[PDB]
Amino acid sequence: AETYEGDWVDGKMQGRGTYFFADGGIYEGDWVDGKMEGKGVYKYLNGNKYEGEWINDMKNGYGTLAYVNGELYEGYWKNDKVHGKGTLTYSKGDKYIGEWKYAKKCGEGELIYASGDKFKGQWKNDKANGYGILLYNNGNKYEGEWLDDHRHGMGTFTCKEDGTIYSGHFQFNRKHGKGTLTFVNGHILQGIWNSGLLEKVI
Amino acid sequence: AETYEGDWVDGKMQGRGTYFFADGGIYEGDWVDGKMEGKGVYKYLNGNKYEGEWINDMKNGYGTLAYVNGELYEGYWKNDKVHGKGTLTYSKGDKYIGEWKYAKKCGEGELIYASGDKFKGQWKNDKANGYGILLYNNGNKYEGEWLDDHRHGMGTFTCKEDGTIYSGHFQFNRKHGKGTLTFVNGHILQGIWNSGLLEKVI
Ligand SMILES: [Zn+2]
Asked: How far is the CA of A184 from the centre of ligand 1 (A)?
């Protein structure tokens, strides 16, 4: 109970030791000047488990977090929070491999869904925002702009089942605005969509 | 241990009682002439649990089977095996609602996948065989003939993303043979496919 069993260089916790915390946490790893630095394992009382780098009593560098619910993070940390390039395996099978800033997907990364769908592009605030490509499980592909996990802006949808390529505007994950359908017989249709429904042909 | 605690009409297990079996099973329900008939609950030693009808020491009629792995069957039984109209909830979320013959899907039924896809049609030997409709999660729809869970024969595929309707031959779940693509601009393409790939246009 808030004890320490390790080396005591110059009367300060330095080297390698074990520390049990008042809230129930336990740390076993390297120490400098009473700080948690180097490498070590922290066992949370809630069942979470961390193994990786430490700087100034905080996760800094590469480390892994084994969560209770089954998730696992493998990546870099800054000031005790997910930060930088890291991989996160979700409970059901989904996996994100990309950049993080302050414990949220921000930057370029890819999500491998357990359904077979694969996204890779730019993330802003834990959601798809900006340019990205979604490779659907059926072979369909969307490449274009995203806003808050919705196909939003202009993108190109190519259908694997019949080869038809849509090129035009999207709003809230649906075809909306000016666009063109190009079929495999060379013919190109121009039209106006409203919430994914073609309503006007030119 | 192979005891009996129930009514004993005319020196035979009749009425309602409890029977513990030598392999570990336990039955609690109605009895006629030493037989398990009427209704009752059988607790298997492996953790399986049955509640429903019984005729002549066997599941006959409607009853439910709570499996260990998480599955659950709700339907009719004949001679201790799944038989007739019944519903089966799979571990991950999938559910079959249809006909069974000898513990296997045989007849007309529908499977509600946890992915959102819904099939409904004829089943032969636990697989799709014959006419059936597959309503995909993306809005796509296939209606045609199936062989061993594969689109096989002639069917009609309609694509929700661009409206293109394919009508032609399928072999081993892929477009193969004579077929026609009908686009939303009225134009109809005739061609020959090879394993889902259009290779010849007429
Ligand atoms: Zn299509």
From this structure: 11
The DSSP string of A94-110 is: -EEEEEESSSSEEEEEE
Q: What residue spans define the domains of chain A?
A: 1-103, 122-202
CATH hierarchy code of domain B1-103: 2.20.110.10
Burial (CB count <10 Å: 0-12, 13-18, 19+), residue A91: exposed
Q: Quote the ligand 1 centre to A175 CA distance (angstroms).
A: 14
The single-letter code of the amino acid at A99 is E
Query: Please, are residues B123 and B109 in contact by the beta-carbon 8 Å criterion?
Result: yes
What is the rounded distance in angstroms from the CA atom of residue A95 to the CA atom of residue A193?
A: 34
Q: Which CATH architecture has domain A122-202?
A: Single Sheet (2.20)
- CB distance A167 to A190 below 8 Å: no
Give the H or E element holding residue A183: none
Tokens matching residue B25: 């099973």
Determine the topology of domain B132-202 in CATH.
2.20.110
The stretches of chain B forming alpha helices (DSSP H) are none
Q: Is B189 on the interface with A (CB under 8 A)?
A: yes
Resolution of the determined structure in angstroms stands at 2.1
- Residue B183 contacts A where some CB pair is shorter than 8 Å: yes
In chain B, DSSP finds a helix count (H) and a strand count (E) of 0, 18
Handedness of CA A60, A62, A67, A72 (dihedral sign): positive
Which residues neighbour A100 within 8 Å (Cβ) at sequence distance 6 or greater?
A: A75, A76, A82, A83, A84, A85, A86, A106, A107
The CA-atom distances, in angstroms, between B66 and each of A168, A181, B70 are: 51, 51, 7
Calpha distance A73→B58 (Å, rounded) = 51
**Bridge partners of residue B87, in order along the sequence:** B74, B97
Q: How far is CA B7 from the centre of its chain?
A: 39
Contact B159 A157 (CB under 8 A): no
Which one, of B58, B99, B98, lies nearest residue B81 by Cα?
Answer: B58
Residue A22 and residue A2: Cα distance in Å, rounded?
Answer: 6
| CA max distance for chain A | 84
Experimental method: X-ray
Element (H, E) at B113: none
Alpha carbon of residue A162 to chain centroid? 32
